Design goal:
Elements: E1 5-9, H1 17-23, E2 35-36, E3 50-53, H2 58-66, E4 81-84
Antiparallel strand pairs: 1-3, 1-4, 2-3
């Protein structure tokens, strides 16, 4: 049960969490365990989506901010996408 999770999309192969955590964090800044970028082992690439684990209301708050203002950024030449799986 995802219970307040922001999802990300459109992550490039070469990107990593620590890169995104610089230029995807104007409003709020996660720590690190929050930002699940799954990565391959053979290709040494990402899976291209990610997950942001936050508190019961914090996920919801942060996301609503992002759904009311300028479009998201890029950190490689790929404009990120935001999703919300509030499956409680």
């Amino acid at each position: 049960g995802h219970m307040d999770t922001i999802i990300l999309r459109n992550l490039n192969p070469h990107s990593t969490m620590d890169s995104i955590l610089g230029a995807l964090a104007p409003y709020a800044v996660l720590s690190s365990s929050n930002v699940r970028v799954i990565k391959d082992k053979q290709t040494q690439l990402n899976r291209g989506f990610a997950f942001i684990q936050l508190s019961t209301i914090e996920a919801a708050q942060l996301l609503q901010i992002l759904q009311a203002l300028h479009p998201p950024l890029t950190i490689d030449g790929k404009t990120i996408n935001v999703e919300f799986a509030k499956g409680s």
